């Protein structure tokens, strides 16, 4: 490069991790610098142009030169934007000579970009825990039943007229002529999960549980809650939690865990004795008289058959959370004794909550997504933090969840489906994750994801809920089509990207299945040793996240976006590391030369592919590797 009034793109580079930003999580009093790189000798001057909300204007802070990068290739420009307790947004105006470009979150522009600037927000923390771990996500009536005298026979009870249906461990899911699939029971119980631990912490490695309903509730389901005081007689009882959550804190069973329970805050179920539509309770519901002491609990359209509730769903009263300082907030999240706070304190001590149907919650039976909504959750987080600052918030949500995790007061982070789930699926698969056929090229994937990350500040990014599949989705394997291959690309990706690994149970050892409810299958146990494929490369993956920061805190950027020999490869790094994903989605093999150089690994050096264990030497700044197809390979030094 040189001063030929022209930018070059390519040398262009920033994002906040460890190189770039030294303060990713400020508080009031931090300043922030930050490192824009470009090529040697590119440039004439750069400027860092931040909006700053505590006056509503632009503020300009030219940069300085800072110093060359190990290879002698790049420049490192710098500048400092003050500390203060508002929320700042940025962008880089960059020129040499006659040529200027622009750079924010979503990269490098010809034109100033008017969106997706990078994010400062003062006090806003994220777990660590959270940004740095594996999360493995249970259904509980289908991972393993470690007390078959809780489990719910056939005939066991009735809800709504129809009796419960238990099935042998491994059979069919669907409910047989004369059942209803919401009333299917396996046995799967919290005891079983507390022995299965040393599987989940050290065959696979994951450190985090987030675990479906296990509160008081009729269906297998359990989002239609009848006790949030009290688990399931199914699952367990109160002690049994208490005891699953010492074993999974535990570092004598493995590395220190941490657990994060379903909330299921936005409805109750419709056999909730505050609701209480089948008088299962002495006490009067809102349903049974308009004088029930929590009538006003929910919303009634016409008392008592017409009511708000969750997408319709008459089983599912939604729950009115009224103006500040309700009886709703309280026994939801402000009370000592709430549901919230009740398991956040000891003797449960539990890490975190995965807020269900959040976008809806509201008060007077409005649909949420306005104003009220985001009152109550930013209230929500206060309440949540004060008791532990390092208690974990994830809101469901399928799309760009930017309003409430942007501004910092809100969600910690989301169930990353457009970020994640959605691309790689149609990027591997060819399919959504309804299994739709629904295909897209490397250079859109790339494109994709990089326009997703933008949506959030960076510490909302590294704590996204990152996963293949899910409870509400058509299995991987099954949109895959039984192809192993495509299951191993997939963990590659997953295991290698920014924000928290989630593995929804059994996608590890690449179980099967379609929709609601064929995607809550009973877990094979003879197929979750590393005697299977998948599964030994899940837990290869997982140490290997766990051996480098930098694929959990570091930087990302793009280096191979192919469409003809669809070849994908990127590069995470920080001050100590520098890795090179390089991933074939292709059929067939591919020969691949790696532009190492960008993420400047210096000439002569080695690199590992920890995938296959092969070694080898960067010459003119290039690794070539022979990938096979639906395979990948993870370059470190
Ligand atoms: O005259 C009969 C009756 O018919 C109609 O009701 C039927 C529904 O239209 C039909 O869809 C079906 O409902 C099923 C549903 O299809 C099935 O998927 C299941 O849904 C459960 C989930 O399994 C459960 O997980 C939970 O969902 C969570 C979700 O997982 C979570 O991530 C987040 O999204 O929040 C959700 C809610 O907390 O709950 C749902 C709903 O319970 O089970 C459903 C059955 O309850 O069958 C219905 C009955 O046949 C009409 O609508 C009705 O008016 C008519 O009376
Ligand atoms: O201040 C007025 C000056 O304006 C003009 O200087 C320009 C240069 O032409 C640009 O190239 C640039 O200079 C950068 C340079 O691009 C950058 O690499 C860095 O240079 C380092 C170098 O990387 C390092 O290896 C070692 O050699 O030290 C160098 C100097 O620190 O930093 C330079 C900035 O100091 O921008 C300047 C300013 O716009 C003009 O050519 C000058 O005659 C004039 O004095
Ligand atoms: O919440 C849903 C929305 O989420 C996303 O919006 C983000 C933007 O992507 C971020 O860049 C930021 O926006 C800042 C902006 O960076 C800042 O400059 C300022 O906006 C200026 C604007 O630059 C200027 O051209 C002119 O229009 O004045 C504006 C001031 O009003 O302030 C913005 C915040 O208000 O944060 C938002 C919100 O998190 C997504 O891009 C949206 O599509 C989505 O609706
Ligand atoms: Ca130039
Ligand atoms: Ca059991
Ligand atoms: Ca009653």
Redesign the pocket.
Known sequence: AANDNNVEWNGLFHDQGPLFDNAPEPTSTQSVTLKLRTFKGDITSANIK??D?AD?A?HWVPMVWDSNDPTGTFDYWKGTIPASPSIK???FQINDGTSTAWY??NGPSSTE?????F?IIPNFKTPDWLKNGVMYQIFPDRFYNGDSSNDVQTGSYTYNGTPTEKKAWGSSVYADPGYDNSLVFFGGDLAGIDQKLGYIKKTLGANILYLNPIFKAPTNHKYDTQDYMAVDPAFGDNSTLQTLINDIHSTANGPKGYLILDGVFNHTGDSHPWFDKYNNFSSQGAYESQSSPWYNYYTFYTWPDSYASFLGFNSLPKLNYGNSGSAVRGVIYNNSNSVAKTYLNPPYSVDGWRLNAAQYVDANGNNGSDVTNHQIWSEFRNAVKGVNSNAAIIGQYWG?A??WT??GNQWDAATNFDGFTQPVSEWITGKDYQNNSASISTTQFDSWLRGTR??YPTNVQQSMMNFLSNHDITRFATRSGGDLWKTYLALIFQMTYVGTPTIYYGDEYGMQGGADPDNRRSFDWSQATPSNSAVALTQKLITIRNQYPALRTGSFMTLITDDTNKIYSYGRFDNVNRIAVVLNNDSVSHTVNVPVWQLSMPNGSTVTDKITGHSYTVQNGMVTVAVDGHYGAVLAQ
């Not at 970009?113 to 600037?117: I, V």
Request: hydrophobic residues 20%.
């Open positions: 931040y909006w909300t509503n632009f947004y940025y962008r924010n979150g970009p008017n969106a997706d600037d994010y760009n930017n309003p942007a501004q933008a949506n």
